[PDB]
Structure formats: C-alpha cells, structure tokens
Amino acid sequence: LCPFGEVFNATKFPSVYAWERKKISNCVADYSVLYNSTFFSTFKCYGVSATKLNDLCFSNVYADSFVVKGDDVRQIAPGQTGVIADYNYKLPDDFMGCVLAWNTRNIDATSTGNYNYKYRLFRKSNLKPFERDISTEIYQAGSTPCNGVEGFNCYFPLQSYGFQPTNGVGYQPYRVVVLSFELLNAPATVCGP
Amino acid sequence: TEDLVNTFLEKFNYEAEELSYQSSLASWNYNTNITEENVQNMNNAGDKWSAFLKEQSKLAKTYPLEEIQDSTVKRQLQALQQNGSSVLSEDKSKRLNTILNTMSTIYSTGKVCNPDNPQECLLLEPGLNEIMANSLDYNERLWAWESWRSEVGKQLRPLYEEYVVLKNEMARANHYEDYGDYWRGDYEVNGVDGYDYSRGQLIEDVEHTFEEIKPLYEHLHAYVRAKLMNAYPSYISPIGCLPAHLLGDMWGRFWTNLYSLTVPFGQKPNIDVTDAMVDQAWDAQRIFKEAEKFFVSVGLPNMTQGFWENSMLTEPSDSWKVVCHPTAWDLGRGDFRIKMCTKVTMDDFLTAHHEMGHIQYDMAYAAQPFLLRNGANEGFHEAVGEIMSLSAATPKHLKSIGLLSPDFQEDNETEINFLLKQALTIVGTLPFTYMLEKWRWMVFKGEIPKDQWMKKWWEMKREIVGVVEPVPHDETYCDPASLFHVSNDYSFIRYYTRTLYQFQFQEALCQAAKHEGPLHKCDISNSTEAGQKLFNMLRLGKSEPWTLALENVVGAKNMNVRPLLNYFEPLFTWLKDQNKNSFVGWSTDWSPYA
Ligand SMILES: *[C@@H]1O[C@H](CO[C@@H]2O[C@@H](C)[C@@H](O)[C@@H](O)[C@@H]2O)[C@@H](O[C@@H]2O[C@H](CO)[C@@H](O[C@@H]3O[C@H](CO)[C@@H](O[C@@H]4O[C@H](CO)[C@@H](O)[C@H](O)[C@@H]4O)[C@H](O)[C@@H]3O)[C@H](O)[C@H]2NC(C)=O)[C@H](O)[C@H]1NC(C)=O
Ligand SMILES: *[C@@H]1O[C@H](CO)[C@@H](O[C@@H]2O[C@H](CO)[C@@H](O[C@@H]3O[C@H](CO)[C@@H](O)[C@H](O)[C@@H]3O)[C@H](O)[C@H]2NC(C)=O)[C@H](O)[C@H]1NC(C)=O
Ligand SMILES: *[C@@H]1O[C@H](CO)[C@@H](O[C@@H]2O[C@H](CO)[C@@H](O)[C@H](O)[C@H]2NC(C)=O)[C@H](O)[C@H]1NC(C)=O
Ligand SMILES: *[C@@H]1O[C@H](CO[C@@H]2O[C@@H](C)[C@@H](O)[C@@H](O)[C@@H]2O)[C@@H](O)[C@H](O)[C@H]1NC(C)=O
Ligand SMILES: *[C@@H]1O[C@H](CO)[C@@H](O)[C@H](O)[C@H]1NC(C)=O
Ligand SMILES: [Cl-]
Ligand SMILES: [Zn+2]
C-alpha cells in the first residue's frame, strides 16, 4: 500500500545538493521487495536489522532520493566528513534507517556526458543532519568582495558530475534512497503484515 | 591564506577531471582511428586542457609556496606553479613550436634512396632499421648509417641550433641555468629534511654509478669486439673502438641484434618458444588473464571491468585504423585500458606484463589528489613495468604456467646465453644513454661551441661508449638529432635511472620473497609479502618525494649500482675469463678511415 515504487522506480532522480524528500504514512509496507533483490548493490541498515524490520511498526518513513558517484556512496553513513556528507547530505550520528543504492550507468550516463547531476563543492559551515541548501550565491573564500561576478577567490558553489559510460565503477552514477525510520509519541502508522 | 590554496585546488582538481578526461577520451579515438575527423577532435580537447594549465599555473604562482604548512598541500601547489614556463614572445614561441614540428616531421618522413637502385627509397622505420638490425654487409650498413646522418641529419643541423637558443632563453627566464637544468628538475627535491636532492647532484650520482659499470661494460665490449672481428674480418681492430654501423641498430643504442653474432653457446636451444607457443594459441583474453593472475597472486587487485570492455586486446577487422605502439592508458575517472598491436606471440606476452605493470601503478595512486597522480620520478614507471617482464621470463614461471616443458634442462651454459642477451640490451645502453645526455647537458650549458658539436660528440663516443665513427663528420652533420628522443625534445637520462631502479626494485622484492638462488632466476609470483612492499610505493604517487618512495621498497635515498651489477655477476665472471687472451679497453685514436 506504501508508494515505494514511486521512489525507487522513479524516472528522474534529483541532484544530491538538492535532494528530495517524500513523507509516507498510513499504508502497508512490503519491505520484501527491497532485500530480495540483486537490484540494490549496497543496502546498509543503520540502527535496525535489514531483515527484522519487516515485522516492526513505525510512525512514518522519510525516503530521501539523490544521485552520487560510486566513490561518494560511502559518505551516506553516520559520521562521515567528505564533500557529499559535509555540504550536500549529512546523516545524523543517531541515524535509524537504511541506505540503499544501485548502479545506474545505463540510465544516468550518456556517451556525450551527463552533466545534469550537480553537487555543492564549497560552503561556509557544514550541514546539520538532514539539512538542505539550494543557494547558488558565489562562494567567497578570500576577503575581497565577490559582488555577483566570479573571479579571484570567488567560485561558483555548484559543480556537476560527469557521467560517461566509460568511467570506472568509482565514477559511475549510483542512485541512493535513504529510508529514514522514526517513532514519535504515536508509534504505529505504517507496519509490515 | 593557507585556506585559500585549499579552495583553489579543490576547484582545480574537479575542473581538471573534466578537461583531462575529455582530452584523454579524444586522444584515445585518434590512436584507435587515425582520421582527420579524430585528429582535429583530439587536438581541440587537448588544446582546452592546455589553455587550462596556462591560466591555473599563473593563478597558482600568486599564492606563496612557503606560506603553506601542510606538506601534501604545499606539494600540490608547487606542481601547478612549476608548470608555468610562459615567459617568451608569442612569435618566438610560435617559431620554437614550428622548429619542434619541423624536426619531428623531418625525422618521421626522412627518406634515403639506394644509389645502386634509385627505385628503392627507404625511410627509417621500416627499411633502414631492417638494414641496421639484420644486414651483415659492412658497406650496406655503412650506407644506411651515413645516409640517415648526411641527408636527414644535416637538415636538422640548423633547426637544432635555433632549437638550443630558444629553449635556453625559455629556461633562463624561469630561474634555470639552461634547458639541461630544466630537465634535471624532475629529480630535484627542495624541502623535506634528509630527503633532499639537487639539480646537480644527479650529474654527480650518474657519473659515480657509471664508474662502477665501466668494468662490466669494458668486458662486454671486449667480448663483442672479438666476436664481431669474425663477423666483419679486416674491418675491426682488436684494440680499437667498435664502428658505429656494426652495433645492431641505427645508433648503437641497443646491442640486442648482435646476439646472433655474439651468442656464447649457440648449440643450446633458445627459450623463446614463440613458434611452438603460438600453437598453444589460447586467446588474447588468456594472455592478459594470465597477466592478471600474476599480479593477483602477488596481492594486487584484478583488472577493472573497463579494461575488459574498453581496451584494445587484439586487432578488430580491417576497416578500422589502429596505431601499433604498446601503451597503457590512465585516462582518469577510473578509466584504465591498454592499446597494443599484439598477436599470439611470446615477446608481447612479456610486454603485456610490462604495460599491465603501468596500469597497476596508475590504479594504486588514484586515491592521491589530481596533481599527485604520477610516478615518483620519470624513471619510476618504466622500472615498475620492467620488473614484471623480468619475473615473467624466468623458466620457473613458464614451467608452472604450462607453457614450457615440465623437464627443461637449465645448464650453466643456458644461463650465460640468457644473461648475455640481457646484457646486450640492458648494459649496452647505459654508456650510450649517459654519454648522449652528457653531450646535451654540456651543449645547453654553453660548454660546447657550435663549431665543435660533432667534434665533441665523437670525442665522447670513442672515450665513453667506445664507438668510433666509420666516416668523418664535419660540423654540417647533426648525428644527435638523427635520434628520435633528441630531435623530438625528450630528456634521455630517464633510461639510465630507471635501469638502476628496476634492479633495486627486483632485488628488494626478491629479498622480500626470500628468493634463494641468483637474482636473474627470481620470480615474485605467489609472494604477497613482496607485493605489499611494492604496493607501499605504488600508492604514494608523486606525493612523497622520489627518495622516500624509493626508500619504502629498496631502503635507499638514491640510485644504487650494486643490484644491477649483482644481476650480471654470473656473466661478469664468465666475461673476465673469456677476455684473458683479449684486450679489455680501447684506443680512442683508431678509426676505420685514414
Ligand atoms: C605540465 O603539466 C602537464 C599536465 O600534467 C598534469 O599535471 C601534473 C602535475 C600531473 O598531475 C599529471 O598527471 C597531469 O596530467 C604535463 O603534460 C603532460 O604530461 C604527462 C606526463 O607528465 C604526459 O602524459 C604521459 O607522459 C608519460 C611520461 O612517462 C608517458 O609515459 C607513458 O606511461 C604510460 C602509463 O600509463 C605507459 O603506457 C608508457 O610507459 C608510456 O611511456 C605517456 O606517453 C603520456 O604521454 C602528457 O602527454 C602531457 N601532456 C601535455 C599536453 O603536455 C607537462 O609536461 C607539465 N609541464 C612541465 C612540468 O613543465
Ligand atoms: C520496480 O520494478 C521492478 C521490476 O522491474 C519490480 O520488481 C517486481 O516486484 C514484484 C512485487 O512488487 C514481484 O512480484 C512478485 O514476484 C514473486 C517472485 O519473485 C512472486 O512470487 C510474487 O507473487 C509476486 O508476483 C516481481 O517478481 C518483481 N520483478 C522484478 C523483475 O523485479 C519492483 O517491485 C518495482 N518497485 C520497487 C523496486 O520498489
Ligand atoms: C603458485 O603459482 C603456481 C604457478 O606459478 C600455481 O600452480 C599452478 O596452479 C594451477 C591451478 O591452481 C595448476 O593447474 C598448475 O598445475 C599449477 N602449477 C604447477 C607447476 O603445478 C599455484 O596455484 C600458486 N599458488 C600456490 C599456493 O602454489
Ligand atoms: C574506430 O572507430 C569505429 C567507429 O567510429 C567511427 O568511425 C571511425 C572511422 C572514426 O571516424 C570515428 O570518429 C567514428 O566515430 C569504432 O567502432 C572503433 O571502436 C574505433 N576503434 C577501433 C580500434 O576500431
Ligand atoms: C578478483 O577475482 C576473484 C575471483 O573471481 C574475486 O574473488 C576477487 O574479489 C576479485 N577482486 C577484485 C574484483 O578486486
Ligand atoms: Cl650517432
Ligand atoms: Zn611501458
């Protein structure tokens, strides 16, 4: 009953800097579609067991979608300090969910080069857990002002991935879905039969 | 200010990934398809990546190098700053690039015609190289040798004169002594206490290590000369130098082709079972999968999927042009392939381990930042690849693979035959390499007047290499430019340094593998301990200085001749006994002419 296919089998996936969020509640979750599949290449559940979660009840599930290269997938975990985990998507140290990812070279990589997927390279401070930043203001690393124009020590914050089919596995596009589980004061709204 | 360089390099590292991978992908299509369509696309992407390095290097110099504390960060900015040699006139650099292109075209298109039959006009490869490597006629070899230096050699004389002037002007503007001091900077380590190295220390160490090679080379020279007197009777003196056109190639850079004339024990069969090993066809995938298992047994990773999907492992159809030089490609972004025109032979099977050694090096230092993805110095890559074919050529490995007969007879005579073949290639090129760079170093330093170029060139050939010109050459010739590396603007001392490095590596890896017998019989297969010691050097890249990366494997901060001399010690004692009734050394006054 839960719209899981609308998140996993979704056509367009967002950039990691502008990751999307879907709030799911009041349905019958069938997590067997996920862990009984060679489709997923990672599937690391932090805080819960990847198998025991099927007979467990929660309050709501937050499915976060984005795209990162293969070498950037290891940053989608509690306690990481890369570029994706610092300026794009930081998971909390007390994260209670599962991180699923799979290779999408045939879908997200073109021979001419897929430059659509972008990520934030520079930011003043780091990102608090589950924070989002869509600002395209010219990052200023030095003292001299940057106005709106680029130039000396004035850099555009967003950089774009280059997804060609000849890239190595570490540089191939992977679609990540971060299932975030939580329980408020009401603990039962979505559960497995 | 130290944080400013961090944000600057963090944009350089990611914008370089874009332009370097696009220029590398376009460069691959030309080498897999020679067509003006691809030649222009390759050059365009390369021009973008070049213009990028122009601006980024100027911007990199604006940041002070000494105001940085982080060693790894300081090393990154330095490489970018040192890449800025843009101190010349737009017109004079345009002429220098015209000179460099003219010499390259003359060398690659130079043709000589047989005076007896003008129908046969031969360029260098193939033709003149086939004469210098197979012909046993003194006059025929003398013709090809003299023609290449009297025709195309003289054309390069005026170009090389202006080539020196413009190159020295460019170098001196970058606080360099000369263009020779420029090339020598690849070994310079300014900073890190205890691991430094100067642009002049290389000259001292190269000459020091070469002094210990003189005894081994003198006896190889004496043995070769005696054998060559039987091949070319009445043309060679038992006490004089060897004529240049009798050395196996156009220049004498390698004595490999002299093995048929200098084989110690010719009655024993040759281990190059290429003919019968062709019958064991297997496939091209089996050849490289065997190379894969070699590195896997030592503890190194398997080849990437891109290697089996995007690489040239054979020769597809006929409607597709392909360049045949063996090359390993590290295009970036995890893209690793090898392009090499290989059949089901055996000499390429050794080169297959060589080129795959380059890939293992490229794979290991991929974790380093962009500016630090290179060998420790220019000689580190070739030394890494050479030890692979060095281990994969031993009879023990060939027995265990199923290629050689399980009951091969390893006499002490078949050991000399193999080592002698190695010495003609490995040791014969050391005096040629050092003497060539010694001449170019002194020319750039202004120590050789223009009216004494060929006089000093051949004075050093007779003294250092022990090779005399067959016919006298005045200052109209330019025999150095008759070699590819000289006329195409490439440093040449790398072939000397890597040759000493590769035996230091092999000695270190075989001691880590606890090899028992002689060093030339060592095979580091199945030795995870030897791979861990080697891997600790491959992963460094150009991050740590070359002295430290060398120390991580061999345990020394400089070159070492002892591993090279110990490799050829079974042959060295045999040569000393063979020359007891000969004359070791040569008179620098005897010449084939009068
Ligand atoms: C200024 O920099 C440019 C670009 O170098 C970049 O910056 C440095 C700091 C490093 O991070 C580099 O990785 C980066 O690209 C220099 O121009 C290029 O220089 C490289 C090498 O320095 C040339 O590429 C290769 O050069 C190899 C030298 O050994 C050649 O050897 C091959 O190795 C492969 C291994 O895969 C094997 O198949 C073989 O053994 C083979 O011998 C190889 O042929 C290849 O050419 C490249 O061609 C250069 N390109 C251009 C456009 O210049 C530049 O030299 C430098 N200038 C300075 C320092 O003055
Ligand atoms: C995304 O699309 C894939 C297909 O490309 C979906 O996979 C399919 O999922 C259904 C269940 O939703 C599977 O049906 C079940 O199959 C089992 C046998 O495995 C059968 O016993 C059940 O009765 C039921 O029919 C189906 O087999 C499976 N097929 C494939 C090819 O994967 C997936 O559910 C979609 N949604 C996601 C991934 O969220
Ligand atoms: C060590 O290397 C040798 C080859 O160099 C391996 O021995 C061969 O292994 C294959 C299959 O594993 C057999 O078909 C061959 O017959 C073996 N060679 C010989 C001569 O018998 C060996 O597996 C490697 N590892 C160890 C632990 O010895
Ligand atoms: C060579 O090119 C093949 C087809 O590519 C197209 O045709 C060639 C002639 C070029 O014009 C190229 O720019 C075109 O895109 C490829 O199928 C093949 O893999 C390439 N390499 C080899 C070794 O054949
Ligand atoms: C190499 O191949 C072996 C055998 O298939 C495999 O067990 C190992 O994981 C591979 N290593 C890689 C792909 O790095
Ligand atoms: Cl010469
Ligand atoms: Zn090589």
Author numbering:
A (entry chain E): 335 to 527
B (entry chain A): 21 to 614
Sentences from the paper on this structure:
A defined receptor-binding domain (RBD) in the spike protein is responsible for receptor recognition. The RBDs of SARS-CoV-2 and SARS-CoV-1 recognize the same receptor protein, angiotensin-converting enzyme 2 (ACE2).
In this study, we determined the crystal structure of SARS-CoV-2 RBD complexed with raccoon dog ACE2 (both the RBD and ACE2 had been engineered to facilitate crystallization) and also characterized the biochemical interactions between SARS-CoV-2 spike and raccoon dog ACE2. In line with our previous research, we used a versatile structural platform that combines a chimeric SARS-CoV-2 RBD (containing the core structure from SARS-CoV-1 and RBM from SARS-CoV-2) with a chimeric raccoon dog ACE2 (containing the core structure from human ACE2 and VBMs from raccoon dog ACE2). The complex of these two chimeric proteins crystallizes in the same way as the complex of SARS-CoV-1 RBD and human ACE2, yet it reveals the specific structural interactions between SARS-CoV-2 RBD and raccoon dog ACE2. As we have shown in previous research, the binding interactions between the RBDs (from SARS-CoV-2, SARS-CoV-1 or related coronaviruses) and human ACE2 are largely determined by three virus-binding hotspots at the RBD/ACE2 interface: “hotspot-31” centers around Lys31 in human ACE2, “hotspot-353” centers around Lys353 in human ACE2, and “hotspot-ridge” centers around a receptor-binding ridge in the SARS-CoV-2 RBM. The five residue differences between human ACE2 and raccoon dog ACE2 are all situated close to these three hotspots, affecting the structures of the hotspots and consequently the binding interactions between the RBD and ACE2. Among these interactions, Asn487RBM forms a hydrogen bond with Gln24VBM from human ACE2, but not with Leu24VBM from raccoon dog ACE2. Thr82VBM from raccoon dog ACE2, however, weakens this hydrophobic interaction network at the hotspot-ridge, reducing ACE2’s binding affinity with SARS-CoV-2 RBD. In raccoon dog ACE2, Tyr34VBM forms steric interference with Tyr453RBM, destabilizing the hotspot-31 structure. Hence they form a very strong salt bridge, which forces the side chain of Glu38VBM to take a twisted conformation.
